[PDB]
């Protein structure tokens, strides 16, 4: 079902860009703009895309536009993998970043809730306190002293979990070792903390802050003292200091009513709302 | 008999008795009021729930009192609030179905049934304060009041978790329980073939919303030796941004007490649980007694709050009293009746009380297409001899203002009005706080003994009186902000009596361009006459004699809604006919030379004239009503002969 | 519950003059004074005019809970005596078999009242001199570290009064599988939550439960403390006044304004605490005083 | 200085109890056996043990071939994994025996160890 549906999302989007691009006549551009997108990228080889949201709102009458805009976090690999097959159909190391623009609706920090996670919402504000350029790994080569120490593998996600359980080395699932620090593909990023606009603040309220990370291509596009528009996407970072907040604290006490026996390595969680983006235009 | 373990109630005896009240009300609450339209409320009140599609019915406490039945039901809610409310919600949802069987083509019957319904009971007594509360009274309904300090960011909380594994990636999930989330060992292929390691992805999972707000209260009938105290509370999903900082809000909630961890390391919980507030219903809306806030400030959340069904925040105007407002508006002696009716304790200053009245009808908020931003503020200093009860005026002014700030002299600093950046306690961070003028943002600030400020204090006043902004640029925030108020202050001269044969500009320790910067300045002095002094002690004994508040009509609450209705529905326009006389009047004011008259005095009259036109429901100006606007300034001037 | 010492001494005068001999009980309580709390109070629950008033519907939310635990005790008691007489092979032993085969609520758990002692005045001690050593206006400087466990009388100035907040004493734990209630008594400063279950029925079985605590079933206590500065009249000629910690529990809370002159009587107990880690000489005992009665000057 | 903390409880709510035929369930079944078996005009094992205390036998005799006539599932369940169900029997033995020791002494005139079962049969001389 969901293996099919996101793949049906994958194929219909694969159907979409491989069709005609722009309706306009010889007065203007005729056709094949997204087809010229890769072919002009083939000239320069910067390995990203600039695709419109508005043309996606045209064809499926918003049925597919209201399919992506809700759970984008569900739709990371499907949007990337099908486009990879579009490239090898037309073109020949290859790493991708997907950028959006032209969001019709822009909101503020006050219009953000936990139900808005995974969805796309545009936020503008005031950039303050940029930080340096630092790498990010996302490609672990970490396996034990047993022979197959060549596991190019997991922890691409936001977890420092290198070793997979089932290899076919002499190593077991409990066997874990350090990452090979020479054979991987990285990317860099910076970390700015945006402040809220002063033209939207209500009475009795100070302007608010929020952290945001620009990864890969969108580094150095930032500017302290600027108004910008963002990618709609949003993430959540685990927090630490929210203890004695107060509140009913969630915990991860696993089940013991399974395997029969003849200690307590359980954990908790308390996170915080963060923000992530890939396209930043600087209008304003 | 069926019974729940902690309680002494049952489902059916509560439910059938609750259905009894929901078909019976005939103004029984007025029968205790003795009566000084008789259909029951909740038929109509469920209908405005019905045809509008709006959820969240609410009610008071006293409706269960006057009804002779369900008197036993009332104290059940006081002692077990968690279970009593939920049983009501079932049969209210059933009462929705009891109405829908009448017309039988209604609103796509399944889905309007499917929507969650809940009740926010409030107004549930006010017996004693926070300090009195014994450890016996754990879970009861508590009404408290006070002001609001700050606002934490949004705290999320998982309601449905998310799990996977690695081999073919079955993606089952589980929800939050009352305390934890548990998880199995093996998942792929059901509980079989021991497949893989369990995965957890915390961005595909569901969440909730929670906000922490720290409060300070004003517990009227204080105990002995009592210091002020601060508490906090834990509002939820629909009440997110239902509160601002500095509002006078009455709070209905439930008391709790929960342990805390030590040093973020171990599972050893400290004893002596930390106590907090677990709110139910909010009195964020304006009181009928005190004044109503402007709509030029709320208009961001008037632009918002249509997306989600919330509280109303505005004192609702009923229908029958609208002609009664138009009845009082047709009064000829309104210009004299209203000022006398403001403060019945002091029998004087009828022009000065009128300025207090015209302080509340203040100006037209004119913003241009680009720029402009011309507010409706007027700012008055009054001064003179003591034994005038000038403070007793201001306390009465302080009670009316919905965001009133009452300050004094020499307890202040330049940092003491903005950027109160300090250390947090429970989250243990460095949190920036809003200042005094940000607590004065909207309303009236009050300052006593104005002559004894510093240079730096009173230098802050230059920015507000001119630009109506505040410029914060130090280590916390470098960003300007506005904080509008109605500035009014008072001081006393050097001599305890102002002597004659001496300039009025001399005997006040202000720089006279800053002194003339104000809109209107008053001087109240003592007179050596005799006729009002017989009128003195007969009035003042009568307030003290026969210990009861008693030839004038004094509407206590007509003016409260009269000002609020006149606030939004009136935008007085100042067209051509006044401009001939006004420019004619200003040059003769400029003609005095050799205190001065500056370009502030040109802006002074137009903000006072249409404020008088905001009185008596005039969206236009008239060439008359301009003369007494001069005369209010001349009321000072004819006191300046000596 | 207020207990003097004078009617005791009046009774102790009374028994010797009319009967052969009474055991001394004033100086008996005067020595140790801590075991005399509960060993006296369990004798109270022997005799009680229990049903003396029909319960009010608006009486107390505490009252409806103890009425259950009184009744749930007896209904559980009524079950076991039915099975044993139905399986036979004077009834005091038949009663006695029921006594030890059933887990019950303890009688310490449902009390609802409190007891405070009261020191004797010198006035009746003026008539008959007895152990009147408990009531003298003594100083913190006069508190030698040999008066531990005694019952004393001090006075001074109430200084830096804290706030009243509840102190947790015992915690209830719902099983949700075996359906029992686990109870944990804490007398330490801190503690821990406990394991998944400790029932007798969840025991000797493969699948034990998993518990969680409850709020409304636990027992709390009023708690607040303060410090007493020396009276500044009996201080020696070149000294600086000290202070002393006094814990207050229960009914007597919210009765001490700061900055007053008050006679505090109580019993003198240590608390397990030492100072810095390297300065510990091995057995360092930090003391306090528990309040029992307030008599204020002025 | 304090003393040790203590833990006690009591089951009140009879909830969450499916008949899973397990640890506590099997123990209650044999209380229904020793006190509540009776053959033709005679019950024997209840009258066996009432002598054995005054004997100070502290032991018991079992016809295992008799047990299949009483119940069906117990015999095959003990047949598969006896070593787990053997010690749980002794608890069902003594809790009956603790009652009888009170019934013995208190009616007409402390230390009580764990008993031991003895079984015998003549089915298959392997």
From Swiss-Prot, chain A:
It is found in: Nucleus. The modification Phosphoserine is found at residue 205. It comes from the Eukaryota. Acts as a component of the MCM2-7 complex (MCM complex) which is the putative replicative helicase essential for 'once per cell cycle' DNA replication initiation and elongation in eukaryotic cells. The active ATPase sites in the MCM2-7 ring are formed through the interaction surfaces of two neighboring subunits such that a critical structure of a conserved arginine finger motif is provided in trans relative to the ATP-binding site of the Walker A box of the adjacent subunit. The six ATPase active sites, however, are likely to contribute differentially to the complex helicase activity. Present with 13400 molecules/cell in log phase SD medium. Early fractionation of eukaryotic MCM proteins yielded a variety of dimeric, trimeric and tetrameric complexes with unclear biological significance. Specifically a MCM467 subcomplex is shown to have in vitro helicase activity which is inhibited by the MCM2 subunit. The MCM2-7 hexamer is the proposed physiological active complex. Component of the MCM2-7 complex. The complex forms a toroidal hexameric ring with the proposed subunit order MCM2-MCM6-MCM4-MCM7-MCM3-MCM5; loaded onto DNA, forms a head-head double hexamer. Interacts with MCM10. Belongs to the MCM family.
From Swiss-Prot, chain B:
Keywords: ATP-binding, Cell cycle, DNA replication, DNA-binding, Helicase, Hydrolase, Nucleotide-binding, Nucleus, Phosphoprotein. One of its GO terms (molecular function) is ATP hydrolysis activity. A motif (Arginine finger) lies at residues 516-519. Its EC number is 3.6.4.12. Belongs to the MCM family. Component of the MCM2-7 complex. The complex forms a toroidal hexameric ring with the proposed subunit order MCM2-MCM6-MCM4-MCM7-MCM3-MCM5; loaded onto DNA, forms a head-head double hexamer. This is DNA replication licensing factor MCM4. It comes from Saccharomyces cerevisiae (strain ATCC 204508 / S288c). The chain holds residues 177 to 838 of 933 of the full protein. Residues 334-541 form the MCM domain. It is an enzyme of class 3 (hydrolase). Its main location: nucleus. It catalyses: ATP + H2O = ADP + phosphate + H(+). GO terms for cellular component: CMG complex; cytoplasm; DNA replication preinitiation complex; MCM complex; MCM core complex; nuclear pre-replicative complex; nuclear replication fork; nucleoplasm. The keyword Lipid metabolism does not apply.
Swiss-Prot record, chain C:
Belongs to the MCM family. Acts as a component of the MCM2-7 complex (MCM complex) which is the putative replicative helicase essential for 'once per cell cycle' DNA replication initiation and elongation in eukaryotic cells. Core component of CDC45-MCM-GINS (CMG) helicase, the molecular machine that unwinds template DNA during replication, and around which the replisome is built. The chain holds residues 78 to 385 of 845 of the full protein. It is found in: Cytoplasm; Nucleus. Present with 166 molecules/cell in log phase SD medium. This is DNA replication licensing factor MCM7. It comes from the Eukaryota. Component of the MCM2-7 complex. The complex forms a toroidal hexameric ring with the proposed subunit order MCM2-MCM6-MCM4-MCM7-MCM3-MCM5; loaded onto DNA, forms a head-head double hexamer. Interacts with CSM1 and MCM10. The gene is MCM7.
Swiss-Prot record, chain D:
It is found in: Nucleus. Residues 1-21 are annotated as: Disordered. Present with 10300 molecules/cell in log phase SD medium. Component of the MCM2-7 complex. The complex forms a toroidal hexameric ring with the proposed subunit order MCM2-MCM6-MCM4-MCM7-MCM3-MCM5; loaded onto DNA, forms a head-head double hexamer. Interacts with CSM1. Belongs to the MCM family. Acts as a component of the MCM2-7 complex (MCM complex) which is the putative replicative helicase essential for 'once per cell cycle' DNA replication initiation and elongation in eukaryotic cells. The active ATPase sites in the MCM2-7 ring are formed through the interaction surfaces of two neighboring subunits such that a critical structure of a conserved arginine finger motif is provided in trans relative to the ATP-binding site of the Walker A box of the adjacent subunit. This is Minichromosome maintenance protein 5. It comes from Saccharomyces cerevisiae (strain ATCC 204508 / S288c) (Baker's yeast). The lineage of its organism: Eukaryota, Fungi, Dikarya, Ascomycota, Saccharomycotina. The gene is MCM5. The chain holds residues 2 to 146 of 775 of the full protein.
């Amino acid at each position: 079902v969901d293996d099919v549906t996101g793949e049906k999302v994958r194929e219909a989007f694969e159907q979409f860009l491989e069709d005609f691009s722009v309706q306009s006549t010889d007065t203007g551009e005729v056709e094949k703009v997204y087809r010229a997108q890769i072919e002009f990228m083939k000239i320069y080889d910067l390995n990203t895309i600039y695709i419109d949201y508005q043309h996606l709102s045209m064809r499926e009458n918003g049925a597919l536009a209201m399919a992506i805009s809700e759970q984008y976090y569900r739709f990371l690999p499907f949007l990337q993998k099908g486009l990879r097959r579009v490239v090898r159909k037309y073109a020949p190391e290859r790493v991708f970043q997907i950028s959006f623009f032209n969001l019709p609706t822009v909101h503020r920090i006050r219009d953000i809730r936990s139900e808005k996670i995974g969805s796309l919402l545009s936020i503008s504000g005031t950039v303050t306190r940029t930080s340096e350029v630092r790498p990010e790994l996302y490609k672990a080569s970490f396996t034990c002293d047993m022979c197959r120490a060549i596991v190019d593998n997991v922890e691409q996600s936001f977890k420092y979990t290198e070793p997979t359980f089932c290899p076919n080395p002499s190593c077991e699932n409990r066997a874990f070792w350090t990452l090979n620090v020479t054979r991987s593909r990285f990317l860099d990023w910076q970390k700015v903390r945006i402040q809220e606009n002063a033209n939207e603040i209500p009475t009795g309220s100070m302007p608010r802050t929020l952290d945001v990370i620009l990864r890969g291509d969108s580094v150095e596009r930032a500017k302290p003292g600027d108004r910008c528009k963002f990618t709609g996407v949003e993430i959540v970072v685990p927090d630490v200091t929210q203890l004695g907040l107060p509140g009913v604290k969630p915990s991860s006490t696993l089940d013991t009513r399974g395997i029969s026996k003849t200690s307590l390595g359980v954990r908790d969680l308390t996170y915080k709302i963060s923000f992530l983006a890939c396209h930043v235009i600087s209008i304003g | 008999l069926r019974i729940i373990w902690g309680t002494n109630v049952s489902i059916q005896e509560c439910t059938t008795n609750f259905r009894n009240f929901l078909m019976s009300f005939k103004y029984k609450f007025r029968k205790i009021l003795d009566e000084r339209d008789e259909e029951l409320y909740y038929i109509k009140q469920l209908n405005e729930m019905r045809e509008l599609g709006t959820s969240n019915l609410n009610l008071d406490a006293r409706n269960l009192l006057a009804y002779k039945q369900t008197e036993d039901l009332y104290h059940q809610l006081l002692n077990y609030p968690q279970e009593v409310i939920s049983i009501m919600d079932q049969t209210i949802k059933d009462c929705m179905v009891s109405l829908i069987v009448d017309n039988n083509l209604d609103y796509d019957l399944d889905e309007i049934e499917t929507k969650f319904y809940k009740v926010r009971p409030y107004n549930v007594g006010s017996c004693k304060g926070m300090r009195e509360l014994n450890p016996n009274d754990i879970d009861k309904l508590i009404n408290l009041k006070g002001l609001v300090l700050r606002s934490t960011p949004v705290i999320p909380d998982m309601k449905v978790a998310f799990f996977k594994c690695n081999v073919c990636d079955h993606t089952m999930a589980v929800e939050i329980d009352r305390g934890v989330i548990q998880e199995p060992a093996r998942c792929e292929r059901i509980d079989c073939n021991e497949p893989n390691s369990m995965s957890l992805i915390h961005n595909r999972c569901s969440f909730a919303d929670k906000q922490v707000i720290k409060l300070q209260e004003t517990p009227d009938f204080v105990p002995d030796g009592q210091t002020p105290h601060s508490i906090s509370l834990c509002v939820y999903d629909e009440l997110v941004d239902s509160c601002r900082a500095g509002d006078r809000i009455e709070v209905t909630g439930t008391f709790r007490s929960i342990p805390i961890r030590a040093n973020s390391r171990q599972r050893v919980l400290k004893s002596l649980y930390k106590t907090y507030v677990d709110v139910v219903h909010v009195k964020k809306v304006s009181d009928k007694r005190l004044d109503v806030d402007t709509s030029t400030i709320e208009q961001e959340l008037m632009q918002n709050k249509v997306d989600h069904n919330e509280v109303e925040e505005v004192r609702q105007i009923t229908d029958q009293d609208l002609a009664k407002i138009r009845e009082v508006a047709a009064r000829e002696d309104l210009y004299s009746l209203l000022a006398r009716s403001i403060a019945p304790s002091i029998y004087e200053l009828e022009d000065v009380k009128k300025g207090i009245l015209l302080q509340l009808f203040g100006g037209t908020n004119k913003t241009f297409t680009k720029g402009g931003r011309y507010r409706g503020d007027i700012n008055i200093l009054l001064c003179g001899d003591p034994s005038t009860s000038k403070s007793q005026i201001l306390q009465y002014v302080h009670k009316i203002t919905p965001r009133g700030v009452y300050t004094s002299g020499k307890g202040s600093s330049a940092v003491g009005l903005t950027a109160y950046i300090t250390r947090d306690v429970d989250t243990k961070q460095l949190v920036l706080e809003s200042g005094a003028l940000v607590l004065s943002d909207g309303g009236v600030c009050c300052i006593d003994e104005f002559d004894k400020m510093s240079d730096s204090t009173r230098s802050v006043l230059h920015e507000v009186m001119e630009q109506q902004t505040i410029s914060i640029a130090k280590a916390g925030i470098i960003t300007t902000l506005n904080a509008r108020s109605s500035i009014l202050a008072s001081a006393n001269p050097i001599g305890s009596r102002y002597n004659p044969n001496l300039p009025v500009t001399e005997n006040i320790d202000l720089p006279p361009p800053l002194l003339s910067r104000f809109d209107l300045v008053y001087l109240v002095l003592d007179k050596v006459d005799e006729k009002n002094d017989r009128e003195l002690a007969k009035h003042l004994t009568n307030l003290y004699l026969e210990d009861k508040p008693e030839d004038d009509v004094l509407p206590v609450e007509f003016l409260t809604m009269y000002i609020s209705y006149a606030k939004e529905h009136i935008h007085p326009i100042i067209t051509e006919a006044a401009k001939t006389e006004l420019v004619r009047a200003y040059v003769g004011m400029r003609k005095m030379g050799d205190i001065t008259a500056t370009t502030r005095q040109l802006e002074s009259m137009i903000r006072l004239a249409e404020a008088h036109a905001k009185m008596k429901l005039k969206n236009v100006v008239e060439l008359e009503d301009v003369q007494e606007a001069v005369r209010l300034i001349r009321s000072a001037i004819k006191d300046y002969a000596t | 519950v207020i207990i003097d010492l004078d009617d005791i001494l009046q009774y102790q005068n009374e028994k010797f003059l009319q009967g052969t001999q009474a055991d001394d009980l004033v100086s008996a309580i005067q020595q140790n004074a801590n075991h005399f709390t509960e060993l006296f109070c369990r004798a109270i629950d022997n005799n009680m005019p229990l049903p003396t008033k029909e319960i009010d519907y608006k009486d107390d939310v505490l009252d409806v809970i103890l009425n259950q635990r009184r009744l749930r005790n007896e209904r559980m008691l009524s079950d076991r005596t039915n099975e044993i007489r139905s399986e036979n092979l004077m009834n005091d032993a038949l009663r006695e078999v029921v006594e030890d085969e059933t887990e019950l609520f303890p009688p310490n758990l449902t009390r609802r009242y409190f007891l405070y002692f009261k020191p004797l005045s010198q006035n009746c001690a003026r008539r008959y001199r007895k152990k009147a050593i408990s009531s003298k206006p003594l100083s913190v400087r006069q508190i030698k570290g040999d008066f531990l466990g005694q019952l004393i009388t001090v006075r001074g100035i109430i200084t830096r009064v804290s706030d009243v907040k509840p102190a947790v004493e015992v915690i209830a734990y719902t099983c949700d599988q075996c359906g029992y209630e686990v109870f944990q008594e804490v007398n330490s400063r801190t503690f821990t939550p406990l394991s998944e279950c400790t029932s007798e029925e969840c025991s000797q079985n493969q699948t034990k439960g998993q518990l969680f605590m409850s709020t409304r079933a636990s027992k709390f206590s009023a708690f607040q403390e303060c410090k007493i500065q020396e009276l500044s009249q009996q201080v020696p000629v070149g000294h600086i006044p000290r202070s002393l910690n006094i814990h207050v529990n229960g009914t007597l809370v919210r009765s001490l304004s700061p900055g007053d002159i008050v006679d505090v009587t109580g019993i003198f107990l240590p608390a397990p605490y030492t100072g810095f880690k390297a300065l510990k000489a091995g057995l360092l005992t930090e003391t306090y005083l528990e309040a029992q009665f307030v008599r204020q000057h002025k | 200085s304090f003393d040790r903390p203590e833990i006690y409880s009591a089951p009140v709510l009879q909830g969450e109890s499916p008949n899973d035929d397990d640890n506590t369930e099997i123990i209650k079944s044999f209380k229904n056996f020793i006190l509540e078996f009776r053959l033709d005009s005679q019950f024997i094992y209840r009258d066996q043990l009432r002598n054995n205390i005054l004997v100070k036998n502290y032991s018991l005799t079992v016809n295992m071939e008799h047990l299949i006539g009483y119940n069906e599932d117990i015999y095959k369940k003990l047949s598969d994994e006896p070593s787990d169900i053997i010690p749980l029997f002794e608890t069902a033995i003594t809790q009956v025996a603790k009652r009888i020791s009170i019934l013995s002494r208190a009616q007409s005139a402390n230390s009580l160890p764990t008993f031991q079962l003895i079984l015998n049969s003549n089915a298959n001389q392997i």
